[PDB]
Amino acid sequence: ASPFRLASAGEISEVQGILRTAGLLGPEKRIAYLGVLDPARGAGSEAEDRRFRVFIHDVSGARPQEVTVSVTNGTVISAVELDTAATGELPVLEEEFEVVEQLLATDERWLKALAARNLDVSKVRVAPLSAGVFEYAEERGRRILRGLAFVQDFPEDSAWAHPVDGLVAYVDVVSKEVTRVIDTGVFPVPAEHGNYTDPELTGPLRTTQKPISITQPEGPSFTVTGGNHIEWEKWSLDVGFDVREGVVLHNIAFRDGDRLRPIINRASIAEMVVPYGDPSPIRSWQNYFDTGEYLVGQYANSLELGCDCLGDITYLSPVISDAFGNPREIRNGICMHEEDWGILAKHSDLWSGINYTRRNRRMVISFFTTIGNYDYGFYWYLYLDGTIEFEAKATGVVFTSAFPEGGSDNISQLAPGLGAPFHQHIFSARLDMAIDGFTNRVEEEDVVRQTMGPGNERGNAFSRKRTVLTRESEAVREADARTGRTWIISNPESKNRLNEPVGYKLHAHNQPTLLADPGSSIARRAAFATKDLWVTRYADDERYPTGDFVNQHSGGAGLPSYIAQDRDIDGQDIVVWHTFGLTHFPRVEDWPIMPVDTVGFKLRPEGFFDRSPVLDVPAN
Amino acid sequence: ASPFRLASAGEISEVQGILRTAGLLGPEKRIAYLGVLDPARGAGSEAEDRRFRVFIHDVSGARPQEVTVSVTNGTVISAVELDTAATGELPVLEEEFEVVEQLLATDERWLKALAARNLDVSKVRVAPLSAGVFEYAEERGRRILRGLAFVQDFPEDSAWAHPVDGLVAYVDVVSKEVTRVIDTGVFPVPAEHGNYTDPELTGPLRTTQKPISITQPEGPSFTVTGGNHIEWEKWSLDVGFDVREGVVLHNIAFRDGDRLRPIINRASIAEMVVPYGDPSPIRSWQNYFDTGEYLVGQYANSLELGCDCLGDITYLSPVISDAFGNPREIRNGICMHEEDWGILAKHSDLWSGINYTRRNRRMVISFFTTIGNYDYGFYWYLYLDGTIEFEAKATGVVFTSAFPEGGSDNISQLAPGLGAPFHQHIFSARLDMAIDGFTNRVEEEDVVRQTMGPGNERGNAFSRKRTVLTRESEAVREADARTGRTWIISNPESKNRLNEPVGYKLHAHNQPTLLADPGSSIARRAAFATKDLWVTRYADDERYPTGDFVNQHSGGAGLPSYIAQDRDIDGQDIVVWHTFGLTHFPRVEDWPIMPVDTVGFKLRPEGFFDRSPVLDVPAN
Ligand SMILES: [Cu+2]
Numbered sequence A, B: 001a002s003p004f005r006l007a008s009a010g011e012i013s014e015v016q017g018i019l020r021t022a023g024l025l026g027p028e029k030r031i032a033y034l035g036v037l038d039p040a041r042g043a044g045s046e047a048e049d050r051r052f053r054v055f056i057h058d059v060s061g062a063r064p065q066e067v068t069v070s071v072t073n074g075t076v077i078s079a080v081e082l083d084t085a086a087t088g089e090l091p092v093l094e095e096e097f098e099v100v101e102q103l104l105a106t107d108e109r110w111l112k113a114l115a116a117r118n119l120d121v122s123k124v125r126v127a128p129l130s131a132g133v134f135e136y137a138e139e140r141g142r143r144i145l146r147g148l149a150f151v152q153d154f155p156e157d158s159a160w161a162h163p164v165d166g167l168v169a170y171v172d173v174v175s176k177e178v179t180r181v182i183d184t185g186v187f188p189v190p191a192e193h194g195n196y197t198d199p200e201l202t203g204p205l206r207t208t209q210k211p212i213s214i215t216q217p218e219g220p221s222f223t224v225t226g227g228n229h230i231e232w233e234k235w236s237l238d239v240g241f242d243v244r245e246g247v248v249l250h251n252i253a254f255r256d257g258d259r260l261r262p263i264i265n266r267a268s269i270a271e272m273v274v275p276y277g278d279p280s281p282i283r284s285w286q287n288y289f290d291t292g293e294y295l296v297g298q299y300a301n302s303l304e305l306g307c308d309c310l311g312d313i314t315y316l317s318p319v320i321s322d323a324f325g326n327p328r329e330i331r332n333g334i335c336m337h338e339e340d341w342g343i344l345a346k347h348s349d350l351w352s353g354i355n356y357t358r359r360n361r362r363m364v365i366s367f368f369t370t371i372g373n374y375d376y377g378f379y380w381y382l383y384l385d386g387t388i389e390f391e392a393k394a395t396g397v398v399f400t401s402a403f404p405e406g407g408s409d410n411i412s413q414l415a416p417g418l419g420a421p422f423h424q425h426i427f428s429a430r431l432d433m434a435i436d437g438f439t440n441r442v443e444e445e446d447v448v449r450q451t452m453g454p455g456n457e458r459g460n461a462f463s464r465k466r467t468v469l470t471r472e473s474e475a476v477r478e479a480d481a482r483t484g485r486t487w488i489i490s491n492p493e494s495k496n497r498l499n500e501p502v503g504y505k506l507h508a509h510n511q512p513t514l515l516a517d518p519g520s521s522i523a524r525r526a527a528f529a530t531k532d533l534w535v536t537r538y539a540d541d542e543r544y545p546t547g548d549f550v551n552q553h554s555g556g557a558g559l560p561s562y563i564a565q566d567r568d569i570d571g572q573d574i575v576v577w578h579t580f581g582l583t584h585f586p587r588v589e590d591w592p593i594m595p596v597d598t599v600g601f602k603l604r605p606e607g608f609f610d611r612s613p614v615l616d617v618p619a620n
């Protein structure tokens, strides 16, 4: 039916069959990435043509391939061999993570390092992390993972409490070789346990928390049709899911009167990077591109009712491919529900004697993923008043290290001898805009202070200025909280009743962007993270701010490459890329398990409607 | 019992009796302000002495007085005559707002202005606004109000939709004379009505919203004793109420194990100013000091259950004095309840096999007030993890004007010919700190970027720096969102188990501060609003950032004067004053009644605890 429906188990199995038939999926092949492609711009095919893009890895060392197939037609549209040393390695395979600890367990260098620390190899867990790109020439064209050790005292023990500092190893997960073992010296391994379910640490559980019952007697106010099409309080959209990006929102539109007005064609978190700021050689290479290197959707959690999602929840169970092309369901991976959101509008008028109060509510679409020690929640909200918001929730267990005897300028102490390297969690939201259609433009709006004098004799006046970003070369912007800087996306060809172009205003949190030196590997690989806002001309192959292949890939692809085309963005099909994130200096309160910290952004209508769009909300 | 208990109707009746018998409350006297005084530093003296502070106005022109009485002993502790021309006029009386429209009704100049516009004087409402201090020497020492006109077509009509621009009058509310009527020219009066309950405008009401039921089968998890003492999930505090500041939180403390640890001695919104940025002479003088000039607590609304506050609500009905000393109860003026706040902490560990999820909740204490056209909600939040937060919700009807032909750089258009002058809503949160006691200090923390080179070969390192504010002369700080600037309040004499001073970190939203020219009257009268954070040494008489008598004060009062003392704040009894607000360029969406917009701040524990304080929270 709808070309925006979720991929089905059948479609995935069919893709597997098409690839096998084409001789592209033999025993040595593995699917590193598989996802359905969005319909092309404009009414092309007389009907729908469901296409899937796949990244195929070869465990024998042969070059991988990027393939696009039409599941509808049963054909391979294109198949290209990839030169990874140039364009990037494919995302890490879940099966390659296990390899690291296994290989190191029998490596003489690794064993000697553990022995020097009096550690039992059988109790040493190894965190298999992405390698990035540095000065190791032998790594070019190879699939490498770097391992950091943590001691697990017993089966249910939290290894993160026992980091083994001064040690790191590099492993080629295809040839199954340990390329390097670096030991910079022994550090005491923190002894205190971080078992947050241990009664001795938690103490008696409080019994003071009375129940909060949230229910909907007549069911939810939103409807779900076609499996993933949502209709709620005038909003209309399709909830998609991609193994790389996770939840993706399509065709966000608002029913204004008798017309369905588009606002955002596609909204997603196109990349997420977690750069560490500890200069120690043991972790100075540490940078997680959770989305681009690991694929966050793949690790989405099954959400439990009453615990993860409270109230009347409607679940979606997206299907993804496993390493062999077989479909795998992520049961209850997406939660959908509406929640009360306090007061919407209120006024008690003396002159008219009318007292008016209305309540607000929001539609929530979310999922939670786990990448090693961290767990991130991705939340999208739609409000009655037309506001759209995204919120990321960061929790889990902080990545640890030893805490240096003489303190540290890049690590904080969580417990005796236990340290937490400073780092950031930076996201990139890709917003393929469609304010009342595809003809859009972006204006940077700053508050303008005025000088006391002629025409402003009392010095109370203040104004605002808007600068249209006309070409991609002028569209790489930075925040300016001091001047209340925001960015407005409007449609110069669609005006409200007051003859002004309709628009939506993006309000950022103005948190610090990437802190790394501009000459670092990470500043180049995560270039998008160095600026708050980027605007590009829409293009089918410009999907991620870091390009298609992020794993062990240097600069050269992504946003910097796209912007160079210097295309016209003044009243055209454009895409907004907003960078936002948290800078983390772990506190003692973040140990042994950290309470949620959040960050996000929102867009509010700006002259999009002819008056408040919530005057028809009942008193209830 | 508790010296922090809410005032009783009887205590107010006692003050009235005391003043009366003392001959301080004659027929010409009016109580402009009345509130109970907080206990002085140190209460080692058994049995407190309930004292009340009172501002007495005289309608015959006689000198006003500031009186302090003891309801415990039934005596007048002090009574001092005020020289308003020097120290400022008393707050505006509710009965004075009425005289403006009434007086103008029979003034020839006013009638001539209305006749030229063909407006029925009986239909013209006049907004009685504070006057401030400008170039009118004859106003020094006199109580003046400036009036702006709005047409009300019928009893239930919203006059705000029909502003009468080009006209303004000044009135002496004591001598009851119209000192001036300024008519700069006729402007069309906007014709469209803004009646949000008129089916003609709202259209058919939605029938799509299903109910959301929030209940607590076993009641709330918090306990209320002594009338206003709250105990909830380890938190302890007293909820007070003042006619000027509104809800005030006292003795906020956290039960950590066996110790009841203080965090903040007193928290309140000590001032809220709404400066307008329209250079027109009709409004260039407009600046509302809602707290200081009008007294926000006085206009607190009676909150309806299931309407203003949903769920299991526990109300407090504070009592205030009327203009004659009579007790007046504000039925259900304060809402108190706890609400679910999503995920608190979550981690699914591969190695231990332990999947952990805990939910969060917050304690809410709030009230809503109405000042003419606007309505503001003040919300204080206490979270399980120790976070303290404040949030202001701004709604109501936008103050209007005509929208000039040709447009405007200082007014936005809401409807045909209807304008909305630009303005700001700036709050000042006075936080009398008590981090583990009164010996505190403040440090400004900035993120520090590092250059690639020796000791940072990969250029990935980044750090932080903290600067102690030692004297008041260096305690006037500005925000720096780009460098992630925050402020930490710590106790240098109380250290956590890691030998680090315990503390709390204030996170600001970094919204723009006062925009007016530095030499403007408003910049001098609301100097607190020009900088984000101020730190002062505690003093009994330093209550408001704008001084005790804000109305028609020439400027420089409050914070600027306090800071000038240049006292030692490095490890002393200090007070933090945080400025935060919204800069409003009204959108079409804000008309005819505006959807809530918010702003606030929060403080999070920073090494205050020895580990996460929510490990004892049950799974449920
Ligand atoms: Cu973190």
Ligand SMILES: [Cu+2]
Pocket (backbone or CB within 6 Å): B394, B423, B424, B425, B584
């Ligand atoms: Cu406003």
